[PDB]
Nucleic acid binder design. Structure first.
Lengths: 53, 567, 453, 61, 149
RNA sequence: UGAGAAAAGCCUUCUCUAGCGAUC
């Protein structure tokens, strides 16, 4: 499930890498905390590149 | 909590027990190391984290590594490096990685990580660090240079440094610093190839690969200073003089109508018989300037020539001045010369005891700029040096031309001259006219000099009359009351009532913010023979309430030092 | 050319302490499938024991000591000489409360050494932190008090009054009045089972589950009045002294004593066991102090005749034994390394204001608590307390949030009453009688005229 | 002591320190002591046991 | 005489600040931790009881087929994409994350007897009772265009 | 309703959120 996401913001372009995630049960009450909580989000997502305007 | 810290201490245990095997460290030393390691570990595993704890952890491990390194040489034991040193270095790398992940924006932490990787870590670990740095800090050209610098001077890979530079220009297309260092780097590569041939292709060895950088950088950045700058590095390399020759010729052909290029050619020509030869070179540099004037008649070109005359005069002296006086006249008729450079020549002429050209500069400045008050001050200083009897007419002509009423240095300067070579009554008349013309904050210095004159021209009685008249003109300074207090002190009477009366007026105006004035008042009651020391209780009480803010704290500290002998 | 190539060794004795396998067994196995599992089991055990050996360096404290010089005897050294020669922190732990208007006092320390509770004969009940000089509660029940004990944390304490058994909060609020337990003489709490054991005048031994609030067992000793009682912390069994000279081992499951051991020629009045559960100390009316080996042998290791009678006995965590005779306490010390205490000559002596009515050692401190008619005194006993405590089991320096987290963990882990046996490892052995019952079912499914006679 | 979590409550069900109704019946007794001020718990016991004797006589009769 | 008593430094055992966490020294001495066998047995017994408490296997049920489901085929490249075939003759593609049906196609007449996905994941193969083997495109048809094999 | 009711000052026990911590 390792993949790269391109996020476009007013300040600049950001490139991020995703390590692992529970894909099938993502839209469920308990697994949704993985993306909501900042600490759990840092566990699975990293910032590999940032290019400001 | 302590489970992670316990894991880390049990991970640290094997190298400590190996060190105890070595004989490098004693058992009590191992106990102390364990205690301090646990104490430092507890700080960085908390829910609230600070950077200084990570810094202290890193510093402690570095100090331990240095101590081990020093002791191993004395013992002579070089075995088991991997068991201890590599484990400590790996732990420090983990700490640095966590700290850099937590605080990405701190460049100083990144540079400290780079330094530690250089000193203690494998070159591939340092290679990974630069990629992490440039990924999120690509907007700083200096970081690109540092990465490219390490590849060339340390890793000896010219290929890696070239790609780092080429990619850097794509992020920063308009940075002149990136081009200059990239220009320098290729010339450094050429020297390594020349030294390569002597130990055992032709085009790069000629410096062609650096010349491609030259043409493109000039096209992108259309600037004379950047163009001249590339020549500066070019002259630094002894080989490929033709490259310097090609750059130098393109200076005049491509870059014209700008003063800087004509200046550089002039200075290039610059670089008892020897003094005659030195004098000969000056005219050739001087000669080039006129074609610069004839081709480019702009004002900015003219300052570059008069200034060039200035250092040679300040650096035989008669011949240098003969150049300056003629080119001053030539510029003056064309009226291109600006106000500031008139002063610089005239001030220069005064210092070397030559007093006639300075007058001509002074006259030319007043005619060209009548309204400028600085010029009228400049002219006045010349005739004071010359001692000519034209000072009186100078004040009449200056104030008539100066329609604005506020001319403070002129009003001051009229006072000292009138004291020197005019009657006493006229000096008082000038002062009274000055107080009428100047009404604002500039009147402060006028009043102080008026009171000082009264004591000198008259006696204490004259100062009293002037002080009484000026005691109500509210724009004041603390020097007004301090001067009057000193005058009472010098007189034989030393009436203490007048001393207190002057202090009360000063405290009324500036008592809210002046801590020194309150402290000076208190010392008068103690030290003066006619003073009453028992009043000091009330003065200290009054000082606290009137003083505001930090001034109140200053008075406490000053009084505390005064109670001791430090004063 | 490396002078010492091998890895760091670990002490064999230290590793043996962290060992739980019976190497003496000589079981034969001729199958490789059996062999593979056995070698892994030894591999698992050896690696765990090695890690704990390295962790010995993490221990930071050292036990106290006291040795004389120039041939002086430590018995004649008094408490005043100790106090001046010890730091200000430990000197503050020696104090003498004087409460004679009320009767003789019985005292109990909490399992964490921070808190102390005491009870007077005339009915004075108070609980206090003793490290700091603060009073948690101080109440006067109108009825007489025979014994005082803590229940798990300092929050709950139980008093054995004249009629019934009562439960109080640490701040003095009465919670329960248990009428089943009547005329109780002695109280003692089993920590890991949450059972409170009561000895009564009528001759009954009762077990109460404080976690649920129900009486799990009520046993008739059939030995008359019960006044001497103690537990073995290792074994979790209850010891009962009788006038016959015999000590009976009891468990809540059985209706009859586990064992009876004859120890004295007269009535036994005191009993105490060590924390490890190896040695048993008893005293009797024959003026004999006895030490028994409880590890399968039950023989008296040491014998000594005393001028006066040792009313009370106690054991510290390092193996020191104290006997209270009248108004004088005597402490015997031994090396304790796989050895009982030496009764040849006492270690320290002290004289109280009144006759001794109760003795206990603080868990993790080098102090001894003595209750008597005059009041309560705290002695200084160098080398009695165990130095390094576990933060997750009994932390003296624990916050309220740490305490409440531990209590839930203990409640999750409560041991049922029926599992108490003479062997704490009895659950590990296979039920041999149940084996053969299963095997039986397995088998089930699987001259010429002489002939005329 | 702390409010038990959902998983903790299932394992630690029926555990309550203050209320032991089956053993001492304190909550029922406390209402009697407060409603009619009784200095000693022993006085309530004598009333209760004597009340049983009156009822036991009536059922036998 | 020489005397020493245990004297814990409070700064070692008490945290420095309110922001700090409590220090927990650990001792592994077996004398301090008795009943290792009975205590661990209760924890294992509690673990099995908690396992039965939290056993909730059912997650969701997908509806939309109009006959009995006969075939299933998962997608090699994506976890959340599955393919199914009903006895009436239709083939449906499901999104496991969204729990809904993406596409519906009338592949065959009668039963569909087998469905397999090409290893690249851009096509699948279906078999029906009409003596026909059909290849389709996994990408959905554009706009409202009718799907063709 | 009936440790009557009402008001002030001290300890004890505990409940909610909200950041924060999990990136080596």
């Amino acid at each position: 499930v390792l993949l790269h996401v391109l996020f476009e913001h007013a300040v600049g372009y950001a490139l991020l890498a995703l390590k692992e995630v529970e894909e099938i049960s993502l839209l469920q009450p308990q697994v949704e905390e993985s993306v909501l909580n900042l600490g759990k989000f840092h566990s699975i997502v990293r910032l590999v590149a940032f290019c400001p305007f | 909590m302590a489970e992670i810290i316990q894991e880390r201490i049990e991970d640290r245990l094997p190298e400590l027990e190996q060190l105890e095997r070595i004989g490098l460290f004693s058992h009590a030393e191992i106990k102390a190391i364990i205690k301090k390691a646990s104490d430092l570990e507890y700080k960085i595993q908390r829910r609230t984290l600070f950077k200084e704890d990570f810094i202290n952890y890193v510093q402690y491990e570095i100090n331990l590594l240095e101590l081990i390194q020093r002791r191993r040489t004395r013992i002579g034991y070089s075995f088991k490096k991997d068991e201890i040193e590599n484990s400590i270095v790996h732990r420090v790398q983990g700490v640095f990685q966590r700290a850099s992940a937590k605080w990405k924006d701190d460049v100083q932490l990144w540079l400290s990580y780079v330094a530690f990787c250089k000193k203690w870590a494998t070159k591939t670990r340092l290679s990974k660090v630069f990629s992490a740095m440039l990924a999120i800090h690509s907007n700083k050209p200096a970081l690109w240079i540092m990465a490219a610098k390490w590849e060339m001077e340390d890793r000896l890979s010219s290929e890696s440094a070239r790609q780092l530079f080429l990619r850097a220009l794509r992020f920063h297309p308009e940075c002149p610093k990136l081009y200059k260092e990239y220009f320098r780097m290729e010339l450094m590569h050429a020297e390594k190839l020349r030294k390569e041939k002597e130990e055992f292709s032709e085009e790069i060895l000629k410096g062609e690969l650096a010349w491609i950088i030259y043409k493109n950088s000039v096209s992108i950045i259309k600037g004379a200073e950047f163009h001249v700058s590339l020549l500066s590095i070019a002259q630094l390399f002894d080989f490929a003089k033709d490259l310097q020759k090609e750059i130098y010729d393109d200076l005049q052909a491509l870059h014209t109508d700008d003063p800087l290029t004509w200046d550089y050619v002039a200075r290039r020509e610059l670089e008892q018989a020897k003094a005659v030869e030195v004098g000969r070179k000056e005219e050739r540099c001087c000669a080039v300037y006129e074609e610069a004037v004839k081709t480019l008649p702009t004002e900015a070109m003219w300052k570059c020539y008069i200034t060039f005359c200035l250092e040679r005069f300040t650096k035989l002296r008669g011949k240098r001045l003969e150049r300056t006086m003629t080119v001053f006249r030539k510029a003056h008729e064309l009226k291109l010369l600006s106000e500031c450079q008139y002063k610089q020549l005239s001030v220069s002429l005064l210092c070397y005891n030559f007093l006639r050209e300075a007058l001509e500069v002074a006259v030319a400045g007043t005619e060209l700029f009548r309204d400028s008050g600085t010029m009228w001050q400049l002219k006045l200083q010349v005739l004071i040096e010359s001692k000519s009897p034209d000072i009186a007419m100078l004040f009449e002509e200056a104030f008539v031309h100066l329609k604005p009423q506020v001319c403070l240095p002129l009003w001051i300067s009229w006072a000292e001259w009138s004291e020197g070579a005019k009657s006493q009554e006229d000096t008082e008349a000038v002062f009274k006219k000055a107080l009428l013309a100047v009404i604002g904050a500039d009147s402060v210095t006028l009043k102080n000099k008026y009171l000082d004159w009264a004591y000198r021209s008259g006696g204490y009685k004259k100062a009293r009359a002037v002080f009484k008249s000026l005691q109500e003109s509210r724009p004041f300074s603390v020097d007004f009351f301090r001067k009057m207090i000193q005058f009472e002190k010098e007189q034989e009477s030393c009436n203490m009532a007048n001393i207190r009366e002057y202090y009360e007026r000063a405290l009324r105006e500036f008592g809210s913010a002046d801590s020194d004035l309150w402290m000076d008042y208190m010392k008068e009651e103690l030290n003066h023979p006619l003073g009453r020391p028992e009043n000091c209780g009330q003065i200290y009480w009054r000082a606290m309430k009137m003083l505001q803010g930090e001034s109140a704290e200053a008075f406490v500290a000053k009084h505390a030092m005064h109670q001791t002998g430090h004063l | 050319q490396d002078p010492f190539p091998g890895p760091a060794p670990v002490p064999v004795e230290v590793v043996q302490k962290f060992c739980r396998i019976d190497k003496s067994r000589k079981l034969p196995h001729s199958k490789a499938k059996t062999r593979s599992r056995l070698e892994v089991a030894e591999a698992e055990e050896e690696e765990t024991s090695i890690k704990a050996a390295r962790s010995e360096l993490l221990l930071a404290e050292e036990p106290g000591f006291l040795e004389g010089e120039d041939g002086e005897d430590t018995a004649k050294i008094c408490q005043a000489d100790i106090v001046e020669a010890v730091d200000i922190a430990s000197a503050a732990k020696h104090f003498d409360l004087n409460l004679r208007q009320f009767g003789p006092y019985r005292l109990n320390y909490s399992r964490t050494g921070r808190h102390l509770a005491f009870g007077g004969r005339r009915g004075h009940v108070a609980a206090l932190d003793w490290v700091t000089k603060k009073l948690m509660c101080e109440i006067n029940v109108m009825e007489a008090v025979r014994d005082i004990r803590f229940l798990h944390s300092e929050a709950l304490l139980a008093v054995a009054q004249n009629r019934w058994l009562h439960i109080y909060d640490n701040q003095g609020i009465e919670l329960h009045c248990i009428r089943r337990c009547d005329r109780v003489t002695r109280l003692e709490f089993l920590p890991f089972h949450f059972l409170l054991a009561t000895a009564s005048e009528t001759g009954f031994l009762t077990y109460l589950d404080v976690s649920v609030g129900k009486i799990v067992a009520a046993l008739n000793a059939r030995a008359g009045r019960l006044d001497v009682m103690s537990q073995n912390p290792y074994n979790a069994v209850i010891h009962l002294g009788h006038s016959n000279g015999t000590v009976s081992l009891w468990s809540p499951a059985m209706k009859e004593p586990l064992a009876k051991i004859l120890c004295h020629r007269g009535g036994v009045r005191a009993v105490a066991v060590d924390s490890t559960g190896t040695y048993m100390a008893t005293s009797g009316l024959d003026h004999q102090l006895k030490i028994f080996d409880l590890r399968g042998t039950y023989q008296p290791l040491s014998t000594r005749t005393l001028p006066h009678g040792a009313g009370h006995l106690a054991f510290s965590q390092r193996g020191l034994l104290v006997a209270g005779m009248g108004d004088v306490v005597n402490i015997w010390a031994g090396q304790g390394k796989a050895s009982p205490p030496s009764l040849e000559q006492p270690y320290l002596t002290h004289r109280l204001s009144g006759p001794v009515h109760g003795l206990q050692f603080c868990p993790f401190e080098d102090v001894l608590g003595v209750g008597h008619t005059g009041g309560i005194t705290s002695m200084l006993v160098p080398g009695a307390g165990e130095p390094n405590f576990d933060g997750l089991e009994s932390n003296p320096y624990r916050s309220r949030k740490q305490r409440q987290e531990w209590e839930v963990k203990a409640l999750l882990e409560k041991v049922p009453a029926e599992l108490i046996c003479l062997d704490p490892r009895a659950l590990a052995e296979v039920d041999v009688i149940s084996l053969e019952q299963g095997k039986k079912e397995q088998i089930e499914r699987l001259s010429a005229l002489d002939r005329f006679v | 002591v702390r409010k038990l979590k959902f998983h903790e409550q299932k394992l630690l069900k029926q555990v309550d320190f203050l209320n032991w109704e089956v053993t001492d019946h304190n909550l029922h007794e406390l209402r009697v002591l407060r409603r009619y001020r009784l200095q000693r718990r022993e006085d309530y016991t004598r009333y209760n046991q004597l009340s049983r004797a009156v009822r036991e006589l009536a059922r036998r009769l | 005489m020489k005397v020493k008593m245990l004297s814990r430094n409070p700064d070692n055992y008490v945290r420095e600040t309110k922001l700090d966490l409590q220090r927990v020294p650990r001792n592994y001495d077996p004398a301090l931790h008795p009943f290792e066998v009975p205590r661990e047995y209760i924890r294992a017994l509690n673990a099995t009881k908690l396992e039965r408490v939290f056993a909730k296997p059912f997650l969701a049920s997908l509806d939309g087929h109009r006959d009995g489901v006969n075939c299933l085929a998962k997608h090699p490249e994506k976890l959340a994409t599955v393919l199914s075939g009903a006895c009436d003759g239709e083939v449906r593609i499901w999104n496991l994350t969204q729990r809904n049906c993406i596409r519906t196609i009338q592949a065959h007449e009668g039963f569909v007897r087998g469905i397999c996905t090409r290893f690249c994941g851009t096509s699948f193969f279906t078999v029906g009772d009409d003596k026909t083997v059909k290849q389709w495109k996994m990408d959905g048809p554009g706009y409202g265009d009718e799907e063709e094999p």
